[PDB]
């Protein structure tokens, strides 16, 4: 017991006072080193968690909380933290707890002034408490903390509400929490799956209500660009589309939800947007389509979808920078009639670069004679490896001046593409019918 609880309380009072100068990372490393002693760790953490619960004269610390309001952090009359200061005391305590997760106090505090896995339950209850539930920052920090610690029913309901209600990094840490909890017990796996499904069904029902208003207002717009106000609650960053897609991506991550009333009206809505002669107007349903192809096309109905909306799914993919074979729409790699040429060209070029991404490519010389380029290139390259061919060739013509290497390479490709069809090599001959095409010369055995 290197330090007593009064010296620890004096150190912990530093978490309440918000001073920018104070080195709180150094204070965190002091508390971390002190917390190697298990009884000290246990008292420190039980105090920090009592500070969170109490967030939800020497001790005269005036924090500027709002305009014209300089609050006292402590109200002592049984010691309470003034709710204006509370969110900062929470933020500093969660900052300390994140380090302790990488690795009585009140009565002592008034005595001065007068002169991992178990408390995970408290930290999951903390999500219900208003100063935290308000603050996206405190929620993100608490979720990072839970994502570290994870390495019951209400506590999972409160963890899922973090996804069904409003932090992309904090909700990816929430995904980590929900996974690592499900790794724990088959019963928590099952209960979190079924409560995810419950939330996704709520989201689907209200999404079908919203798209039903959208479709109805598109009916009333046409029957007489698209800036339908019903669109605002789909464009919104916190739209049920993004919540539904997030929840489905977590469901599919836990797998290793019957809504045909949604899917068929997403159908007729997309069809009525496409018939309404506007194009990006579809994109307010892109995440609902991505949900469709998540829930369907399990690692069919999605194929009839890609047929009846073919040009729509193409508008989606062409607009999306999501790489076709890394996004959800990868399944249709093999059903290729449902994509545009330039979409397939991008997929081609990205998958080619992905397969050869491990290869460092160098520059590579090709020394040729202007009068012999074809045979000099054959000699130079025909024994080269494919990966040496994949190097960028720059061509040097003997004694010629320097010139733009790109234009000189383009010229080189042009001359070669000619010489392919010089009859002296007997490689290609014109179709006797067309007379402008070329096919293998069956007389190349000469």
């Amino acid at each position: 017991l290197l330090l007593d609880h009064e010296a620890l309380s004096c150190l912990l009072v530093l978490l309440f006072v918000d001073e920018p100068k104070l080195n709180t990372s150094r204070l965190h490393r002091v508390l971390r080193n002190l917390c190697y002693h298990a009884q000290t760790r246990h008292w420190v953490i039980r105090s920090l968690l009592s500070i969170l619960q109490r967030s939800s004269s020497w001790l005269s610390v005036s924090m500027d909380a709002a305009l014209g309001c300089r609050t006292n952090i402590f109200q002592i009359q049984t010691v309470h933290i003034h709710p204006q200061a509370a969110p900062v005391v929470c933020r500093h305590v969660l900052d300390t707890l994140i380090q302790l997760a990488k690795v009585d106090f009140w009565d002592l505090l008034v005595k001065l002034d007068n002169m991992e896995a178990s408390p995970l339950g408290q930290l999951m209850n903390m999500l219900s408490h208003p100063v935290i539930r308000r603050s996206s920052l405190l929620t993100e920090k608490l979720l990072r903390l839970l994502s570290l610690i994870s390495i019951g029913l209400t506590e999972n309901q409160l963890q899922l509400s973090v996804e069904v209600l409003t932090s992309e990094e904090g909700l990816e840490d929430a995904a980590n929490v929900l996974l690592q909890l499900s790794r724990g017990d088959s019963g928590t796996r099952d209960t979190v799956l079924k409560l995810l499904l419950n939330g996704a069904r709520h989201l689907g029902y209200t999404l079908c209500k919203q798209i039903g208003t959208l479709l109805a207002e598109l009916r009333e717009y046409n029957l007489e660009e698209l800036q339908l106000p019903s669109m605002s609650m789909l464009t919104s960053k916190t739209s049920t589309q993004k919540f539904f897609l997030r929840v489905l991506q977590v469901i599919i991550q836990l797998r290793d939800l019957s809504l045909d009333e949604l899917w068929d009206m997403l159908g007729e809505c997309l069809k009525e947007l496409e018939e309404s002669h506007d194009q990006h107007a579809v994109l307010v349903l892109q995440p609902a389509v991505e949900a469709f192809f998540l829930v369907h096309a399990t690692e069919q109905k999605f194929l009839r979808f890609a047929e009846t909306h073919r040009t729509v799914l193409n508008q989606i993919l062409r607009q999306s920078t999501t790489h076709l074979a890394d996004g959800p729409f990868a399944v249709l790699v093999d059903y290729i009639r449902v994509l545009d040429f330039d979409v397939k060209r991008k997929y081609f070029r990205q998958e080619l670069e992905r397969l050869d991404e491990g290869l460092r490519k160098e520059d590579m010389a090709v020394h040729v004679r202007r009068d012999h380029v074809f045979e000099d290139s054959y000699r130079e390259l025909h024994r080269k490896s494919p990966e040496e061919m994949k190097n960028r060739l720059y061509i040097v013509f003997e004694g010629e001046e320097g010139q733009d290497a790109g234009g000189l390479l383009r010229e080189w490709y042009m001359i070669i593409s000619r010489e392919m069809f010089n009859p002296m090599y007997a490689l290609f001959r014109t179709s006797p019918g067309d007379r402008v095409t070329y096919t293998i010369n069956p007389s190349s055995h000469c």
Binding site: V333, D340, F341, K344, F348, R435, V436
Partner: protein
């Protein structure tokens, strides 16, 4: 990885999409049983103007057998029997079958489809 392209699209990937002067093609079109002011022909030209560059190129391959644009223009469009202009023929068979091509004559047989939408759908389904 190449098998994702069509037999048209591999050509369009290797040699690129040509820029088609539809005015040059129209100037070098021969109409045999259709006429230049037939409604199905105005629908044909409207469709071909409405098609993007890849479907236009796929059409050119369908009717000429290639995506290659003649340097001198379509007046110099070759066929099996010397310079042959592009040509549209009315297909007097039933109008529930696609147009058909005889690329050595640069010949299109085109049923008298009853509407712009159906003609566009059938041509796009052919290409």
């Amino acid at each position: 990885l190449i098998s994702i392209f069509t037999e048209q699209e591999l050509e369009l990937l290797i040699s690129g999409l040509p820029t088609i002067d539809i005015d040059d093609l129209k100037s070098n079109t021969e109409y045999h049983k259709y006429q230049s002011n037939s409604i199905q022909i105005q629908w044909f030209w409207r469709a071909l103007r409405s098609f993007d560059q890849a479907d236009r190129a796929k059409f050119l391959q369908f009717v000429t057998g290639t995506s290659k644009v003649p340097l001198q223009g379509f007046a110099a469009l070759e066929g099996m029997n010397g310079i042959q202009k592009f040509q549209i023929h009315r297909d007097d068979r039933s109008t529930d079958r696609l147009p058909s091509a005889h690329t050595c004559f640069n010949q299109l047989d085109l049923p008298a489809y009853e509407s712009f939408e159906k003609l566009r759908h059938m041509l796009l389904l052919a290409i």
